[PDB]
Amino acid sequence: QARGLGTARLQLVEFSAFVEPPDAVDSYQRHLFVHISQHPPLESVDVRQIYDKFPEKKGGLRELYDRGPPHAFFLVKFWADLNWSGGFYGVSSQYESLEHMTLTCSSKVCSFGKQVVEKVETERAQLEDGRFVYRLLRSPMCEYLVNFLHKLRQLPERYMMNSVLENFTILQVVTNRDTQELLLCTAYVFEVSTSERGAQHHIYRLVR
Numbered sequence: 001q002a003r004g005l006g007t008a009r010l011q012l013v014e015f016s017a018f019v020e021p022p023d024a025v026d027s028y029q030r031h032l033f034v035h036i037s038q039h040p041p042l043e044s045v046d047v048r049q050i051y052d053k054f055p056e057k058k059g060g061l062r063e064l065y066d067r068g069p070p071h072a073f074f075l076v077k078f079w080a081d082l083n084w085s086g087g088f089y090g091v092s093s094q095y096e097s098l099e100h101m102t103l104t105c106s107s108k109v110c111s112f113g114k115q116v117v118e119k120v121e122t123e124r125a126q127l128e129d130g131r132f133v134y135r136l137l138r139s140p141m142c143e144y145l146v147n148f149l150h151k152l153r154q155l156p157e158r159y160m161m162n163s164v165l166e167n168f169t170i171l172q173v174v175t176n177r178d179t180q181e182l183l184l185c186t187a188y189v190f191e192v193s194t195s196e197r198g199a200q201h202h203i204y205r206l207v208r
């Protein structure tokens, strides 16, 4: 059914993680580590295969999928661009719905399948052109991720970065804060891209 990352209840408009150098105040520039812009059917990947790559018990993938709805589950493979010092590291997300809601967005960093960091934010709907928009713009990246990126940047070989990234995942759960029904669940897995190629991504439906 799904052709992009979203459902009929909540569509991802844009997502990106970036850094702006200290000199961005003079001449502006931002480096994008990963970036999705949503301005045929998607491919499918069975969710059982990636269970162990995300935490267990409550808030883990199997219990989340168990809860449903199954069509709300996506996997995004990222080729991150780590080719960009004390600048600003940020994440920005924008979603769109037909109805007015208060969203709770939970993001989980997992390492070898265990939760390491979690950030939980709420966002109330804002009524715009015929539809509601939810704007979580310019969240400071947590210090864990910034230090991770700084070290990962420093590894002498790409396949080493890739081996390290094999064990690092992010799970993003968006729910209706009032009714607790799940709206969107996105599993992110990561590889490093090659210098001249910037960030790229591939989106899959998660089935069972």
Ligand SMILES: *C(=O)CCCCCCCCCCCCC
Pocket: 017, 033, 034, 080, 091, 107, 108, 109, 117, 118, 119, 140, 141, 142, 143, 145, 170, 190
């Ligand atoms: C810290 O801020 C806790 C959770 C943050 C979630 C944002 C993750 C966005 C992707 C970061 C880039 C990863 C590149 C390997």
